Design an enzyme around this catalytic site. Structure first.
Site, PDB file in Angstrom:
ATOM      1  CG  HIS B  13      -2.131  -0.922   0.995  1.00 43.85           C
ATOM      2  ND1 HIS B  13      -3.358  -0.502   0.530  1.00 43.85           N
ATOM      3  CD2 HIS B  13      -2.234  -2.258   1.180  1.00 43.85           C
ATOM      4  CE1 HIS B  13      -4.175  -1.537   0.458  1.00 43.85           C
ATOM      5  NE2 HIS B  13      -3.518  -2.615   0.848  1.00 43.85           N
ATOM      6  CG  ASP B  55      -4.210  -4.017  -3.428  1.00 38.50           C
ATOM      7  OD1 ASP B  55      -4.952  -4.426  -2.511  1.00 38.50           O
ATOM      8  OD2 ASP B  55      -4.494  -4.144  -4.637  1.00 38.50           O
ATOM      9  CG  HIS B  91      -2.707  -1.771 -11.379  1.00 36.92           C
ATOM     10  ND1 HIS B  91      -2.280  -0.648 -10.704  1.00 36.92           N
ATOM     11  CD2 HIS B  91      -2.236  -2.832 -10.681  1.00 36.92           C
ATOM     12  CE1 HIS B  91      -1.586  -1.013  -9.641  1.00 36.92           C
ATOM     13  NE2 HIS B  91      -1.544  -2.333  -9.603  1.00 36.92           N
ATOM     14  CG  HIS B 177      -4.801  -9.830  -6.507  1.00 35.21           C
ATOM     15  ND1 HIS B 177      -5.863  -8.971  -6.693  1.00 35.21           N
ATOM     16  CD2 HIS B 177      -3.926  -9.177  -5.705  1.00 35.21           C
ATOM     17  CE1 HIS B 177      -5.646  -7.852  -6.022  1.00 35.21           C
ATOM     18  NE2 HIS B 177      -4.478  -7.953  -5.413  1.00 35.21           N
ATOM     19  CG  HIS B 213      -7.456  -8.504  -2.351  1.00 33.22           C
ATOM     20  ND1 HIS B 213      -7.705  -7.206  -2.745  1.00 33.22           N
ATOM     21  CD2 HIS B 213      -8.645  -9.008  -1.940  1.00 33.22           C
ATOM     22  CE1 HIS B 213      -8.985  -6.933  -2.564  1.00 33.22           C
ATOM     23  NE2 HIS B 213      -9.577  -8.009  -2.077  1.00 33.22           N
TER      24      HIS B 213
HETATM   25  C1  LIG Z   1       7.308  -2.843 -14.724  1.00 25.89           C
HETATM   26  C2  LIG Z   1       6.741  -2.107 -13.520  1.00 25.89           C
HETATM   27  C3  LIG Z   1       6.121  -3.162 -12.622  1.00 25.89           C
HETATM   28  C4  LIG Z   1       5.492  -2.685 -11.310  1.00 25.89           C
HETATM   29  N1  LIG Z   1       4.326  -1.789 -11.430  1.00 25.89           N
HETATM   30  C5  LIG Z   1       4.136  -0.599 -12.020  1.00 25.89           C
HETATM   31  O1  LIG Z   1       5.007   0.003 -12.638  1.00 25.89           O
HETATM   32  C6  LIG Z   1       2.916  -0.089 -11.904  1.00 25.89           C
HETATM   33  C7  LIG Z   1       2.683   1.098 -12.480  1.00 25.89           C
HETATM   34  C8  LIG Z   1       1.475   1.795 -12.476  1.00 25.89           C
HETATM   35  C9  LIG Z   1       1.511   3.013 -13.146  1.00 25.89           C
HETATM   36  C10 LIG Z   1       0.388   3.821 -13.227  1.00 25.89           C
HETATM   37  C11 LIG Z   1      -0.792   3.400 -12.628  1.00 25.89           C
HETATM   38  O2  LIG Z   1      -1.895   4.190 -12.707  1.00 25.89           O
HETATM   39  C12 LIG Z   1      -0.844   2.182 -11.955  1.00 25.89           C
HETATM   40  C13 LIG Z   1       0.289   1.379 -11.874  1.00 25.89           C
HETATM   41  S1  LIG Z   1       1.982  -1.151 -10.999  1.00 25.89           S
HETATM   42  C14 LIG Z   1       3.226  -2.227 -10.817  1.00 25.89           C
HETATM   43  S2  LIG Z   1       3.166  -3.703  -9.981  1.00 25.89           S
HETATM   44 MN   LIG Z   2      -6.463  -6.080  -3.870  1.00 24.35          MN
HETATM   45 MN   LIG Z   3      -4.997  -4.927   0.079  1.00 24.38          MN
END
Ligand SMILES: CCCCN1C(=O)/C(=C/c2ccc(O)cc2)SC1=S
Ligand SMILES: [Mn+2]
Ligand SMILES: [Mn+2]
Ligand SMILES: CCCCN1C(=O)/C(=C\c2ccc(O)cc2)SC1=S
Ligand SMILES: [Mn+2]
Ligand SMILES: [Mn+2]
EC number: 3.1.-.-
Lengths: 331, 321
Positions: B13, B55, B91, B177, B213
């Site tokens: 988080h 998360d 995401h 997850h 999660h």
């Molecule tokens: C290869 C990177 C791997 C790890 N990684 C990220 O770079 C993320 C990025 C992200 C960016 C914008 C957004 O709105 C939500 C998440 S989430 C995640 S795990």
């Molecule tokens: Mn979650």
């Molecule tokens: Mn959580």
């Protein structure tokens, strides 16, 4: 075998691939007849990749707007960008000077990708970086990106000009502390560019070519669509785009650049032609029966895209863009 | 190699600010301290593989620059200790799948499993580890189907993972997850749509099931060993009695697995209960918060008139209900 860099004792040579301004994701002539340039652009990119492998380059330099969209690139464009980034990394180490972009996370990801790979480097600031080429050559990179944060200068043209010169002086001083080779990479407009139409809806940074550090072996520039040999000492080249984005580029030669450096010898380069589709503009006073014949005759066997420019409406115009799938713009 | 030491942490988080509706508290400094303790413990125990679930970012779709910086920072700190396998949560960003595959292709010390397709990875000492990923079914975040066709879809993939887990080399690890059905002492969905999976449908032929999660640690079952590690900090007062940290799992081919809980020791929480807020209560509240090195909640039952500005005089008091 292995798939890492070689280490040749006392090697004083460096083969460079420099390509620029891919504009991945562009659709041309949206206001008249949209044309997705992806297939043509991917063909040109494949030709540049193949030439990098054949010549066994030691280092690949990427400048300019690799993505057409400044702030909302499509998934397909991003996929193609990362795809071709990997195709070059498999050939030789890559150094990327990203163009004008807004997203602030991009610098973090660029530093992350750089930290985890020894075959790609994203230069996101003015700080010099030392990289290793394919055959072990130590290469110092002098980056001159678009001054971020202050995309609005927040200052007059006099302190700004002195700021840019100060940055160029620092790069000069750092280029003197070089091991083997030193390469300058910049994202700006050389002062008084000859045959340069103008800013294509953007704020331009103007730099005098004499202010480019003379003690670098090569100056790799980007941001302009047309190939230009700015100067020979230091050899300063815009490679240009790989396709003719619009009809202002009708007379341009499009491709990449192969640069060979040898300590003790003067640098030499060859242009790698991407041979993209041609463009043609047809000019008429009015579209009369003589003009209709000239348009239909030329477009029939022309393997590229055609623009028609005329002055006055002379009645109802026939569905030229229906009978001619080649005709993309009649204004 | 017939051994495998695992560090499994989840649900960082990163970027969370707690109690925004009453007294916002940026948990970054506390969270980084807890993260540092987990990184140090991974180095001390010399783990072979690091599993990241849950998360890792608090914001699902708008993480701050600072949060993204911390994520990539601690991702790199984990990669320096042992190879990392990450099961990213739900995401929206669509580049995330492309970037995840790109990073995975260019580094041999991190793997992002972005789909249901199995991936074979290599641990620090050469152990071949098959990863059976069960991410949140993307695209259909809205099920677009009744609870009957959807449930059969999920079961089909768990069956597929079971069949793919049988084709394993050395070890096989499940990463999922979702919310296990009938979680004991589980408050409920924390402002989200939950996918419920019965724990018996987790393929039994895996050596370990790494889930995420959930904020609180849970040993779901022992065969196959199924663990939620929980968060690294006490995000809210429902976690007041929780012990926070990661999980160290040791696998031996032919032997039953064993695990230890790695305590991250984050700040404590305390809820103070009173019938009414009288003058004696204010004295006790002010005295307790003065000497409590954590965050305090006060809940009272009877309306006690107007109470002094407790959330002004007490920087420790974050919530009054
Ligand atoms: C290869 C990177 C791997 C790890 N990684 C990220 O770079 C993320 C990025 C992200 C960016 C914008 C957004 O709105 C939500 C998440 S989430 C995640 S795990
Ligand atoms: Mn979650
Ligand atoms: Mn959580
Ligand atoms: C010209 C070099 C470009 C290098 N580059 C990006 O632009 C990437 C991602 C991106 C994501 C969203 C957005 O709006 C813009 C960019 S990732 C990456 S490498
Ligand atoms: Mn540009
Ligand atoms: Mn450009």
């Amino acid at each position: 075998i292995h798939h890492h860099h070689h280490h040749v004792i006392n090697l004083k040579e460096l083969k460079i691939l420099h390509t620029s301004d891919w504009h991945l994701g562009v659709t041309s002539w949206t206001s008249s007849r949209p044309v997705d340039r992806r297939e043509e652009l991917k063909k040109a990119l494949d030709k540049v990749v193949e030439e990098a492998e054949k010549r066994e380059v030691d280092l690949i330099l990427l400048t300019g707007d690799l993505l057409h969209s400044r702030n909302n690139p499509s998934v397909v464009a991003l996929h193609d960008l990362l795809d071709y980034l990997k195709r070059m990394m498999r050939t030789a180490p890559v150094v990327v000077l990203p163009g004008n972009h807004d997203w602030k996370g991009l610098k973090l990801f660029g530093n992350f990708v750089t930290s985890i790979s020894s075959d790609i480097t994203f230069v996101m600031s003015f700080e010099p970086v030392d990289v290793e080429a394919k055959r072990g050559q130590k290469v110092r990179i002098l980056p001159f990106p678009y001054p971020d944060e202050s995309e609005a200068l927040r200052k007059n043209e006099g302190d700004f000009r002195f700021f840019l010169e100060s940055r160029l002086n620092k790069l000069y001083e750092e280029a003197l502390k070089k091991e083997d080779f030193a390469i300058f990479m910049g994202h700006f407009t050389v002062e008084g560019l000859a045959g340069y139409a103008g800013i294509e809806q953007g704020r331009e940074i103007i730099i005098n070519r004499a202010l480019i550090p003379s003690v670098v072996d090569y100056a790799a520039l980007g941001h302009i669509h047309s190939f230009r040999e700015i100067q020979k000492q230091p050899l300063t080249i815009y490679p240009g785009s790989l396709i003719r984005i619009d009809f202002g580029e009708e007379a341009d030669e499009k491709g990449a650049v192969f640069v060979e450096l040898k300590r003790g010898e003067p640098p030499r380069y060859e242009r790698i032609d991407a041979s993209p589709l041609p463009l043609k503009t047809l000019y008429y006073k009015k579209i009369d029966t003589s003009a209709l014949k000239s348009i239909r005759d030329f477009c029939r066997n022309f393997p590229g895209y055609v623009r028609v420019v005329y002055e006055e409406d002379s009645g109802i115009l026939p569905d030229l863009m229906g009978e001619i799938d080649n005709l993309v713009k009649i204004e």
